[PDB]
Paper text:
GTP tubulin is known to assume a curved conformation in solution and a straight conformation when integrated in the MT lattice. Here, we modified our original method for the preparation of human α1β3 tubulin to purify Drosophila α1β1 tubulin. We first determined the crystal structure of Drosophila WT tubulin within T2R, a complex composed of two tubulin heterodimers and one stathmin-like domain of the RB3 protein.
Based on this assumption, we expected that the residue substitution Y222F may produce a stronger bias toward the “out” conformation in the T5 loop, leading to rapid MT nucleation. In the case of the Y222F mutant, the T5 loop was “out” with bound GTP (note that we did not succeed in obtaining crystals of Y222F with bound GMPCPP), but was poorly defined in the electron density maps in the GDP state. In short, the Y222F mutation gave a bias in the structural equilibrium of the T5 loop toward the “out” conformation, as we aimed for. Although tubulin structures within the T2R complex showed the T5 loop in the same “out” conformation with GTP in both WT and Y222F mutants, the situation could be different in oligomers. Despite the lower concentration range employed, Y222F tubulin assembled much faster than WT tubulin. With Y222F(GTP) tubulin showing rapid nucleation, 31% of the oligomers were nearly straight, whereas with WT(GTP) tubulin showing moderate nucleation, only 12% of the oligomers were nearly straight. The results showed that the interdimer interaction is stronger in the Y222F oligomer than that in the WT oligomer by 1–2 kBT (ΔGolig = –9.8 ± 0.2 kBT and in the range of –10.7 to –12.1 kBT for WT(GTP) and Y222F(GTP) oligomers, respectively). In short, the Y222F mutation caused a stronger inter-dimer bond, leading to a longer, straighter critical nucleus. As we compared the dynamic instability of WT and Y222F MTs in the GTP condition, the Y222F mutant showed a reduced catastrophe frequency and higher growth rate. The effect of GTP hydrolysis could be less pronounced in the Y222F mutant, as the T5 loop does not switch back to the “in” conformation.
Numbering used by the authors:
A (entry chain B): 1 to 278, 283 to 432
B (entry chain D): 1 to 278, 283 to 431
C (entry chain C): 1 to 37, 45 to 439
D (entry chain A): 1 to 38, 45 to 438
E (entry chain E): 4 to 30, 44 to 143
Amino acid sequence: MREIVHIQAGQCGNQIGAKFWEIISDEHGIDATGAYHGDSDLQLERINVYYNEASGGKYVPRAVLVDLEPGTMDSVRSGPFGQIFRPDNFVFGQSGAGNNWAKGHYTEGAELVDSVLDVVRKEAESCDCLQGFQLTHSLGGGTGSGMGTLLISKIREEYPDRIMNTYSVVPSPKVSDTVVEPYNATLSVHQLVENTDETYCIDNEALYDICFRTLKLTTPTFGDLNHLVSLTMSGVTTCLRFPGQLNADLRKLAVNMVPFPRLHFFMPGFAPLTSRGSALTVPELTQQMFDAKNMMAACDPRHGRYLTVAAIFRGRMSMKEVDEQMLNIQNKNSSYFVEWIPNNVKTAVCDIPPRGLKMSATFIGNSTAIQELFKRISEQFTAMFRRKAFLHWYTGEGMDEMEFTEAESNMNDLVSEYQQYQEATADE
Amino acid sequence: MREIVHIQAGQCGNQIGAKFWEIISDEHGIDATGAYHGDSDLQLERINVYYNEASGGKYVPRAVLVDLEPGTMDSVRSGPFGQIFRPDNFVFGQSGAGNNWAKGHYTEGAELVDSVLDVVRKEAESCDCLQGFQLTHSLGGGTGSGMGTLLISKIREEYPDRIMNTYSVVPSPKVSDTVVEPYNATLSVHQLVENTDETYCIDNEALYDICFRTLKLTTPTFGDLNHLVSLTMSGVTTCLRFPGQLNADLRKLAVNMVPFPRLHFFMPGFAPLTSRGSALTVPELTQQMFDAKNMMAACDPRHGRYLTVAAIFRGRMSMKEVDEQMLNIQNKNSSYFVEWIPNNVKTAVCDIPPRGLKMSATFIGNSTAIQELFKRISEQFTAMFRRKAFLHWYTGEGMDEMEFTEAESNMNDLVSEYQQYQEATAD
Amino acid sequence: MRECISIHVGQAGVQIGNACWELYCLEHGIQPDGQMPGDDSFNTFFSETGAGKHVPRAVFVDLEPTVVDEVRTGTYRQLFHPEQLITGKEDAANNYARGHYTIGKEIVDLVLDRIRKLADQCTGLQGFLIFHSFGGGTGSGFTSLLMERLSVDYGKKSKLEFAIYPAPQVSTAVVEPYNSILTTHTTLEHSDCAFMVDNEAIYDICRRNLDIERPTYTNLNRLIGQIVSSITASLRFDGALNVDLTEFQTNLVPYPRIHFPLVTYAPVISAEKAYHEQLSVAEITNACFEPANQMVKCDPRHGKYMACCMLYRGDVVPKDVNAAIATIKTKRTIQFVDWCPTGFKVGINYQPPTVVPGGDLAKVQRAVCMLSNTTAIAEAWARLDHKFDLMYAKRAFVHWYVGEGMEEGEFSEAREDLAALEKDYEEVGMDS
Amino acid sequence: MRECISIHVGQAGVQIGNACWELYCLEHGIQPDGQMPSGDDSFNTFFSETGAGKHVPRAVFVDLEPTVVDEVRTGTYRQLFHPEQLITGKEDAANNYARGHYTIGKEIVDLVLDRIRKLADQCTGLQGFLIFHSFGGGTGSGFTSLLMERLSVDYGKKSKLEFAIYPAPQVSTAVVEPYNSILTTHTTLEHSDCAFMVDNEAIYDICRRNLDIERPTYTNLNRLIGQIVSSITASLRFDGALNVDLTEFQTNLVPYPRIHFPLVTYAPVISAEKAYHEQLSVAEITNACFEPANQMVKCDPRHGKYMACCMLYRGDVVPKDVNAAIATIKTKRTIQFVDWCPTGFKVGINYQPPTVVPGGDLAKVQRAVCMLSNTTAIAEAWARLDHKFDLMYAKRAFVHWYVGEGMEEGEFSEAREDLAALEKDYEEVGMD
Amino acid sequence: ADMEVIELNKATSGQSWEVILKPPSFDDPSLEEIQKKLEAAEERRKYQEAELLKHLAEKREHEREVIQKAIEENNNFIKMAKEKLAQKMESNKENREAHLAAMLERLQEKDKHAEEVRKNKELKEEA
Ligand SMILES: Nc1nc2c(ncn2[C@@H]2O[C@H](COP(=O)(O)OP(=O)(O)OP(=O)(O)O)[C@@H](O)[C@H]2O)c(=O)[nH]1
Ligand SMILES: Nc1nc2c(ncn2[C@@H]2O[C@H](COP(=O)(O)OP(=O)(O)OP(=O)(O)O)[C@@H](O)[C@H]2O)c(=O)[nH]1
Ligand SMILES: Nc1nc2c(ncn2[C@@H]2O[C@H](COP(=O)(O)OP(=O)(O)OP(=O)(O)O)[C@@H](O)[C@H]2O)c(=O)[nH]1
Ligand SMILES: Nc1nc2c(ncn2[C@@H]2O[C@H](COP(=O)(O)OP(=O)(O)OP(=O)(O)O)[C@@H](O)[C@H]2O)c(=O)[nH]1
Ligand SMILES: [Mg+2]
Ligand SMILES: [Mg+2]
Ligand SMILES: [Mg+2]
Ligand SMILES: [Mg+2]
């Protein structure tokens, strides 16, 4: 369990993926040219989990950049760490997906899917011990959602024994691009329930709310949203790229976090909440685990019960203090953890804080409260589906109305399942 | 839709036809020899609609001059602009039609009809894009009425897809005392109802009245009546001869003006009303649209309802003022326009005024009030037909009494139809 | 790549094409001879010859040669190859039956042949942009025939229209409501999206905002060209946010028949004044919901929005756009249907709206073009349908169509279809 | 000669082996390169000798992943071991027993047995095996149980003694550790002769309390574990008199095959940084033996009954003082033994003094003691583990991870039923 | 005081003995078994992986069925558009020709009547 192959698909997937690569490069002391200029051995100990070592001292991200349109690829190449990427790993079509899941999954996406598999196969065969795949994408558009989910199932066919992990950006009317977002998201959730092992739910509703309410940004932009996403992704991957005992690899994390196969949707949390232009004690950080204000999915952790939680503390802090505060947070809030999964909160402490901060906390939660996010998508979906609004754009691509009823049913079943375990008692 | 072939038949047709050719030649800067000596580019832009370009820079009217008697043809040749015409295009017989429609349509006219078709075929085949035919003739005589209507049906047979347009001079007891004029006119109306696409009704009753009452000419002559006809014809063909958007060709005009196939009889209007030896404002010009005194057909526009109207303003005037005044004239007179044909009044403004004037207005009206002109002909006809007076003039030529009953019925039906749509409500 | 073929039909379609292609040349630095001394997105609308000259991916068609002859002899006569400027001899005489059957059938194959040759030069054809009036014989009849033949030759390939809605102030024919209903009926099934432009709205904006006493087609087409250029700027440039032919369709069309967006444009400033100062992003965004700035006369307060697409251009920042749209979301006067959770597609291009030197429009720092699907646009169909009924009840002018081989049943079928469309806008505006 | 082969399985087994072998080297005067500048020859039971005069541990270090063993391969003692005895795979068991037993373990098991066979070939009087492993890890649980099964086939009557790490939340790595513990105990019950359990919480708390270490690391825990393992094996590696052979462990501590889990107690555990204190007497260290605070497994011996007690004294200890110390303890305390066993202790004195790693957390003491007692009170550790198993298993939480590796649900029922029978056995044995 | 000490062993580095405080109140697998169990587990692991691939193959077949459905629908739309237009163009051609044939039949009849009038004029004249 060493190498991870990263895939970023569509406008959203490429934007948050480029931001991920720039934060972790800074943390690992890697410059825009792939050169290491750090001052710690912890920075290079697990560098191979995400980077390949190329000709003469340089490190190249094991990343495949995908889109059905070239514009997004160009903006990444031009961006801050654009030249760090392997040029042969940029795979793009010319047609675009027209913000249509059916075009990404069945038509134009199917035409470009083989070109992507060939690049990810080259990266995977190069691995001494492949952990699996990490995909960043949006659920609201056409390429990230439709083609990204098509890629998951084609990779599932060739690598059925590897871990499939996603960072899935949930659409919100608060920061919306297209009218059909609830259809594209529902058709993607249906695919993620069946084919991924771990999905981090990155909700644009929660990110907009953090920027507006907490960071006091009257008019947040994608840059403000993506600054929170980059800090969150740096936090959730801490275990994978620095030496440590707990959840050090994709399979060990899945085994610790997923008690039931379909319930693999995580609610990420982060403290402190910062803006792009600029404190915090151990008890203050531990408290944010139950704070809906610090959640990256628009759900309240106090509304459900945590099945499992991974808490990651970063920076110079006392491990003894972290241990004391974590025990207190579980004992004081006993009613928000399922009683039938003993010691279900695992804590890890890393001496290297994220880029720009001196201390931080990141929470990977598998909470039954995530059903609120799925219910919100379901209600937006039924509002359109009841009237069959915009359906000709999907049926025109060869889809049947039946696939919509099936995607909706599966998602309502998933909500019903979270509710079933939220109510499940130890005394059967 | 480029070239128009013009035909003038009989004494009246040749007289008003020659006058049309001299007015439009002056407007287009063409002299009696066919030479252009104008100053404006608008004068030559659509010169090909009526003129052929001959050897050297000369322009020759695409006109066929027809008569069963030679006299009017000699008069035309001698007249002003007589030499402009193509000599081979003068087709004449020697016999005459004796003010008898039967002689023009069936006997003498039938003998000369082929000689005419020979000349019009040569003109029509020379056209890059033939619009159709334009005929000037009288309805009360023998040649213009009988032979002119025979020509329409023969030309129609060979060119069924072309527009057939006439300038038809309606008889009046005021001008012409040749007693059988109601018979010749009725037999011609019957033909025009069935075979023309657009007929401008030029009424001698209205022309006589304008000269006598408005122009104060105690004894008007054909020269005085024809001065009004020349100004009116210059006005109605403005759209065909000069660059413009509205009614630029014969078919576009017909489609805008004729809602029902048989109701293609227009009431032309003109302001100012001038003598042969003589400027109004925009509001003054627009008012004359409802003035019976300015109508070339002896009908009152306020007596009926306009199905469609084309208003043509010529001279240096504000298009904004014309637009304001035209809106006001239809809003104030809403009861005189049929409600079930929306926006049925189309206005056009041309910078070139007619010969002799600085500003003018011409109105092409398709009004239900034209039934007054047909009723007048019908009553005169029945007065004679009831007694079978002069019938042997027509039966002697091989005609049956049945053709008379049929022509009369067709005309009464046309009156009944104008009345039906005058009373037709949107409900 | 991502090519778009422009088809201009009849006098209105051709004269509007004149304004558009002149403006695209100015916007991309292309000289009238096709030469240009790097974005490269303009290649979606211009092909390139071996000699380095740029040629529009366009066909100009008219059944009469007068209008196209002005292009053939004008400033841009070297920009187009003569094979792409197609004309017959006789026009459709403001008769749909002549455009579709009698006169159109004689030139239809030639037009398709030239479109086929333009399509051959496309590696990723998005579809077609068809410009035509609803009123003219060629604009109505020939476009309907062409739409039908394009569906046979290109199947479901995207077909979007720019249609001139008739207005009495500049109307050329009494039968225009007949031609409009017949062409809408035939075209409904073959069009994917039709942007309607009411001549009275363009006329009144010219009078009010530009101080032009009696606007001519020159004035109307300069403004129309500005709007068409705004709609195609996302295709011909690569800005902060782009939108292709497919993205317009997916966002603006919820049901196949409901494909008529309302176009709004701001700011329209007279080349005079100078003391106009510069309008903010919020100011130009607000103006899009004002009925005075609409391309079709109708009242959006009497209707409900199902989709709104904002096409910004010039000195525009996404932060400024989001703040402006946020204030618009809170407007009680701007109602959306309940089955539409989100109705905002934003696109931003950095290239300011270029104006024709010597023209009536001023050089602004930022401008916006909104495309909105509102049920209020059914008011334009109701106006047209009523005028049709008045004439058809008496069979007034119907003999002109029947004489060309058309049947009266086609008038009944066409009107019944538009009556169903009126009911569709009513049903779609209902709450669930 | 009485040779013993040590088998270190998984991260816990390998890291504890590091501490054990470092301490044995210190105790026998062996340098990290295997040299010893040479008491008695008993050290040969744990170290073979090469032709070059170097001493090599009779040990195999196994992990399904290479990170932990790689530290041994590159560390200070990289010359003490030959690379053939440090065996690693590429992919670990991902904290899943089924993965370590049925999937990954299956491919490396033969290689490990082959290397064990080669170490056994060098033995003249092989006593048996000492297996160090965690209950919680996928390798410590799954691979050890697979290895125990094959060792029973290849070495019929050879003794197998375990040193097993009981899971503790303070240092726990996985939620499913109670599943792995019950599954490995079930499969290993029949193949082990004696298993000395070590609760990570007990040693974690002794490090905090006795050594003043705020947040003890595995380095601190294993240094302490190493002292206890050294105390137990001292009579095999030195010419001792109690538990001098492996078979003697079953004879002295195991009355029934299934009840093979002795409780280990150790005293004194003194901080190295302690201000020069007076040495603890024999009475003082003996009394501490009977205090729950000094136990390796958290449980209450007051709630149970002893069936065997072995006192392993080390250093400056006289039999007269031991007997006086034991006499007082019986006088004051209860020391309830089961009715079929006599109340009494088997005492052993190993004169070799207690050795500590220089620079470590433990002070060098003059005398120390390690008690091994088979008490029914240890069933409290099984009850804790069994309850956590039941809570998760009732909901089939995490079970899909095991079934996906080829395991059947019936194995969970069988494993739990077997540990329910074990709980009943401790109850039956303690009855009278 | 009652404690029975019993010497056991005494060696170079050790000494051992038993201390009695009170007397008591009351006086194999096979390689084949292992191999059978491990192979059974491997077959279950392989069976579930094989069933997963069979279902992923069913999703690949569905993907082809939707693409084929899209292509058939576009071709059927072309087929319907082609015959609707061919029917419309041919009906219109029949109608326009019928209207123009009827108008030339009317004109022809009028010309037959004209020669019939000419016939009567001739017998009225002469005689
Ligand atoms: N947080 C965040 N959300 C984004 C970003 N870009 C787009 N989104 C969201 O993602 C959804 C749209 O998905 P996209 O990935 O942009 O679509 P696409 O795959 O590029 O589709 P095409 O344009 O057809 O190629 C919406 O709900 C947006 O709010 C970004 O940079 N950050
Ligand atoms: N306005 C006008 N009417 C005329 C003129 N000449 C004759 N008319 C009218 O035309 C009718 C008589 O018809 P004519 O044209 O002279 O006769 P024709 O068509 O030549 O037939 P024939 O004399 O039989 O050869 C009467 O209604 C006259 O009032 C003229 O120059 N102007
Ligand atoms: N905005 C605008 N409208 C125009 C223009 N030219 C004509 N129109 C409108 O189009 C309608 C008339 O149709 P046209 O396009 O001129 O006719 P056509 O398509 O050439 O057809 P025919 O000439 O009948 O063969 C009326 O509503 C006019 O106001 C133009 O340049 N701009
Ligand atoms: N005392 C002690 N316990 C340890 C050590 N390392 C791990 N553990 C415990 O062992 C359990 C986890 O099992 P591991 O031995 O690390 O895992 P493994 O045997 O390598 O198996 P995989 O990594 O899953 O293949 C937890 O209870 C840990 O606290 C160590 O060095 N000392
Ligand atoms: Mg994109
Ligand atoms: Mg005469
Ligand atoms: Mg035209
Ligand atoms: Mg391990």
